[PDB]
């Protein structure tokens, strides 16, 4: 209601107080990079496939940055699964596995960045992400590693030691924090199907679906990491995502032009 009322509660109450939480919710909402688009590139589904998959996407990135501002995050892939399997067999906790997976996503960001270096597009990192503002303004794109920085403080899943917040969640959380206008997941299928199209003959394509409808039909952990769907329902800025096939030439260019290729998943 008032700034003086919010500041009095902030000084006199615990941060857990529902009265304080409700007053903070009425604060104004500033978007840091409202005109940027975050693009997640799959590790196992794209980058691990090599030249045939990566080279056409590099061409699309160079072409797209003429009219679009892009933040491009990389997945991890089969090298992370090997590390997870070694470490899990030793009894190491989820927080140790999270550090191991971050280094694989760093590898993939470095390989992509070297194919883009002659176009001026850099690889960025650090806890401050301090190279993002200047690079976006001058060359309209940056490359970053998709893994979140939780490391040993990673929240475990209810079962097992596989970290539940990986490169899909990391990319999404950056889009939500920066107040970006669009979030696009680039993988190796046309979109969401009623079942895994690799292991089922009769899967049916789904062009548009809500998170609740996905849970009601057993798709909570399908083409996206399951925590992404829950974060999507809590989000303030990014209330839908789009999943597209990166192996189809021009699919990323057309998604950025507002064509409805792939599947659109809405928070509500």
């Amino acid at each position: 209601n008032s700034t003086a009322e919010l500041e009095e509660l902030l000084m006199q109450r615990s941060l857990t107080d529902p009265q304080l939480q409700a007053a903070a919710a009425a604060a104004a909402d500033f978007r840091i990079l409202p005109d940027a688009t975050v693009i997640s590139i799959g590790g196992q589904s794209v980058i691990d496939r090599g030249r045939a998959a990566v080279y056409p996407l590099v061409d699309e990135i160079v072409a797209a940055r003429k009219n679009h501002k892009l933040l491009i995050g990389t997945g991890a892939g089969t090298r992370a699964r090997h590390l997870y399997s070694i470490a899990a067999g030793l009894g190491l906790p989820a927080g140790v596995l999270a550090q191991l997976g971050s280094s694989v996503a760093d590898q993939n960001a470095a390989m992509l960045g070297q194919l883009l270096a002659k176009h001026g597009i850099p690889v960025v990192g650090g806890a401050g992400l301090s190279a993002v503002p200047l690079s976006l303004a001058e060359v309209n794109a940056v490359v970053f590693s998709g893994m979140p920085p939780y490391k040993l403080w990673m929240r475990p899943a209810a079962e097992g030691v596989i970290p539940p917040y990986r490169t899909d969640a990391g990319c999404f959380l950056l889009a939500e924090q920066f107040g970006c206008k669009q979030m696009i997941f680039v993988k190796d299928e046309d979109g969401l199907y009623t079942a895994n199209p690799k292991t089922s003959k009769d899967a049916t394509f789904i062009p548009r679906i809500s998170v609740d409808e996905m849970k009601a039909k057993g798709l909570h952990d399908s083409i996206l990491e399951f925590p992404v769907l829950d974060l999507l329902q809590s989000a303030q800025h990014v209330r839908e995502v789009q999943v597209v096939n990166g192996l189809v030439p021009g699919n990323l260019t057309r998604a950025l032009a507002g064509e409805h290729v792939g599947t659109i998943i809405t928070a509500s």
Binding site: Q21, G91, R155
Partner: protein
């Protein structure tokens, strides 16, 4: 379940509001900690306190999202940690930062008896959305560290005796009843303020090692010493992990 990385470690979390009282509270606490160094191997983690409320007030007035507010509050927990370590420097105690805690704590606890760090986790601009107040704060980060290490315990040092049925310094203080013991699931089903992060109860539900956490009054000398020996002098919180 996963193995324990540092099974002999005791973790102690010092509340920001305790540090905010200045020398009147810090000097007796420092003297108690000094006497504990030959008895336990300690990781001491500090919370943020009232300065985080001021930066929340300026940042929320500027419209900043929760991923911007989280590292601003963690910086204040780091400053409390530098202050506490300076008072213990003559005993060989230094402050260490987030990357050192996650990768080199074992060698630092071999060089010296205790280490000081920040209790906030390094969630940075990847904090969860939903509330405009960062949910993963000092209680939550300290528990995440202690359970991942498989430490022998975590003790939370507060400016009140423990958890009450209502804020003992608030409007409904007359109806506040002290809770000697409770469970994380019982607290999570309640509504109203607590002296600990609500997200602490969530990470307790997925814990793998730590079975109980005690909240004690750091303004009464001797209670931290007793809690580290397992004596019941505050509120005991059962996490839900079952013993063998």
């Amino acid at each position: 379940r996963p193995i324990r990385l540092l099974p002999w470690l005791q973790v102690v979390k010092i509340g920001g509001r305790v540090m905010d009282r200045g020398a009147d509270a810090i000097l007796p606490l420092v003297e108690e900690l000094r006497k504990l160094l030959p008895e336990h191997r300690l990781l001491i983690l500090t919370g943020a306190g009232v300065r985080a409320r001021h930066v929340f007030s300026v940042g929320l007035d500027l419209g900043l999202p929760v991923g911007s507010l989280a590292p601003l509050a963690a910086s204040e927990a780091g400053q409390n940690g530098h202050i506490l370590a300076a008072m213990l420097a003559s005993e060989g105690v230094s402050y260490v930062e987030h990357p050192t805690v996650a990768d080199q704590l074992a060698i630092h606890l071999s060089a010296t008896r205790a280490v000081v760090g920040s209790a906030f986790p390094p969630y940075h601009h990847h904090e969860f959305p939903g509330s405009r107040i960062p949910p993963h704060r000092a209680d939550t980060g300290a528990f995440l560290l202690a359970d991942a290490f498989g430490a022998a315990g975590l003790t939370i040092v507060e400016n009140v005796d423990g958890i009450y049925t209502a804020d003992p310094n608030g409007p409904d203080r007359g109806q506040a009843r002290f809770l000697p013991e409770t469970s994380a699931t019982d607290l999570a089903k309640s509504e109203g303020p607590l002296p600990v992060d609500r997200a602490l109860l969530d990470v307790m539900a997925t814990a793998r090692h730590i079975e109980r956490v005690q909240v004690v009054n750091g303004l009464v000398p001797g209670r931290l010493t007793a809690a580290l020996r397992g004596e019941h002098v505050g509120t005991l919180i059962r996490t839900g992990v079952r013993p063998a």
